[PDB]
DNA sequence: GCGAGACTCCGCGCTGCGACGTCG
DNA sequence: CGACGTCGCAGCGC
């Protein structure tokens with residue numbers, strides 16, 4: 124009763140006994156064995172109980188030649204795909220990557236109900252460290268840790284069998300993993316039921332992982348010439364900014380040096396020094412009204428960020444898609460977050476700057492709009508669809524607090540953020556530009572989620588006591604919100620956690636800390652996690668339900684990764700392809716024929732993802748790029 | 758294995774560059 | 782003195 128690896132493809136009789144038993148199993152685990160040569164799948168291990176790992180070789184030599192590779196590929200797809208009336212669950216460590224490797228390297232599209240123990244670990248504690256196979260075995264199967272004691276890829280985030288960079292055979296890594304993750308996932312399912320989170324796991328979180336796998340196979344379209352065009356414009360503005368700045372300072376300085384900037388502004392120019400000599404964005408936002416140089420430093424930092432942190436990473440990661448005839452970006456989704464919202468890495472498409480303006484040329488300069496999102500384009504002939512939850516966290520705060528004033532501002536009032544800048548600056552709400560509106564937006568959510576008066580004063584260019592009047596006024600105006608905050612802190616001090624709309628718990632032991640810094644931090648986390656975490660739940664429910672509806676149409680492809688395998692073994696592009704998620708907004712790449720059908724499916728499924736005491740307002744915008752979106756009435 | 762400090766008081770998140778160190 | 786290295790910040794996003 125140790126690791127028994129059964130090489131099922133070594134004897135044709137043993138293989139048909141294996142296929143027979145496999146087709147009876149309602150639950151099993153698989154672990155892809157991948158080696159270098161490379162995304163070479165040399166086989167997979169299946170486990171449906173105990174310490175038996177049935178290794179299905181997809182390569183060798185000791186295999187029965189009567190089992191051709193194409194024969195073995197037929198049985199592999201037959202056992203990994205459903206008949207749509209039989210419920211069958213597959214346990215897969217790192218399901219997203221395995222799903223993509225199976226499709227792209229083996230031509231097999233998984234068609235069952237999936238369970239990733241990594242996702243289960245996050246669901247039970249969202250602040251836990253990102254799980255590794257070692258951590259899951261250390262936690263749940265500590266007796267089995269010797270099996271991995273030799274394995275050193277175990278403490279990595281990547282699946283054991285998927286880690287081709289290992290001196291161990293893929294057969295042994297996959298076999299070990301299949302047994303460990305099968306029994307671990309059984310423990311994790313008992314914990315999910317104990318916490319009443321298994322329906323969230325099976326109906327929301329795992330299907331959410333399925334949608335992100337389609338997104339990662341799709342990628343997002345990217346125009347290299349559009350991005351290169353903006354870099355030249357920006358770099359010319361940067362050269363002019365540096366020239367004008369050095370004339371104002373009377374000498375050359377380093378924009379990247381906080382000391383040179385502090386010396387010029389305060390030591391030389393004698394600008395109000397404000398514990399001081401700080402070159403922060405808050406300090407320069409106030410000083411830019413007195414002298415032009417602070418504003419030039421802010422513009423220099425904005426453009427340098429766009430060039431060094433956006434332009435070059437995007438052109439670094441662009442890949443050619445020969446089937447669509449375009450370049451695309453393929454980011455990696457990340458769902459192990461504190462509040463359950465999805466982010467992206469390599470590169471982080473969510474960080475693409477909003478549109479900004481640069482004046483160039485003589486005589487005050489003519490305006491030019493830098494829209495880096497305009498570089499993200501659909502496939503030739505398609506459109507980008509952008510449906511957005513209007514004021515999601517504010518409507519969730521209204522549903523949970525029943526604050527009649529907030530509900531009134533949402534249903535009838537004008538834009539809150541523009542009205543905040545108006546009362547702040549004593550100006551018209553229409554005169555508020557996007558930069559000022561963004562300042563008022565952070566002021567809004569900052570005050571709501573517990574910002575102090577010292578920081579609010581540094582953000583508003585006023586002193587701490589005048590900012591305290593703004594905070595005190597908000598509490599006076601919005602007592603329903605303030606009582607929801609008092610009640611949330613109280614219930615978190617009693618329970619040790621807070622809950623989202625779906626029941627997910629975030630544990631905040633600092634709520635009972637005596638140090639006032641740690642206590643207040645947990646108190647603000649408690650209020651924010653409930654709202655932001657519930658917003659993340661709703662967007663996930665909508666993403667899953669939209670994908671379920673798009674696949675009811677036979678013309679639809681699951682992803683570009685699927686269709687480009689069906690072109691390799693006469694497919695006009697159809698349907699909408701999930702390309703990006705923006706915390707309260709979903710982007711889709713849709714064919715022109717189905718631009719209206721997908722737009723109606725997206726809006727209706729978003730507006731009815733959950734039922735709240737406040738309606739979920741959704742606005743759909745379609746355009747020829749992420750940056751050139753126009754309203755679409757749907 | 759404990760929990761200094763006076764350091765830390767909107768929340769969530771990713772990453773290229775700069776500041777200070779190191780090998781040679 | 783230079784190349785290469787490492788960790789955290791401060792820039793941007795929601």
Ligand SMILES: CN(C)C[C@H](O)CN1CCN(c2cc(C(F)(F)F)cc(C(F)(F)F)c2OC(=O)N(C)c2ccc(F)cc2)C1=O
Pocket residue numbers: 517529532536539542543544546547566567568570571583592593594596597600601
């Ligand atoms: C609808 N009526 C006609 C009322 C009319 O709009 C009056 N205003 C204007 C803004 N505003 C408001 C609204 C909300 C939200 F709707 F989201 F609940 C939140 C804040 C918050 F959080 F920023 F304080 C708000 O700002 C404030 O209340 N103050 C005191 C404030 C103003 C400016 C500033 F720079 C800092 C604070 C509000 O009620």
Ligand SMILES: Nc1nc2c(ncn2[C@H]2CC[C@@H](COP(=O)(O)OP(=O)(O)OP(=O)(O)O)O2)c(=O)[nH]1
Pocket residue numbers: 513514515516564565566568569572706707767768795
């Ligand atoms: N705590 C906090 N949450 C923020 C902040 N900025 C954004 N968020 C969260 C709450 C709202 C959510 C989405 O914000 P967006 O800016 O995309 O949307 P919005 O705030 O409703 O404005 P708009 O409709 O103009 O996009 O992200 C911030 O500064 N602090």
Ligand SMILES: [Mg+2]
Pocket residue numbers: 511512513514707
């Ligand atoms: Mg929004």
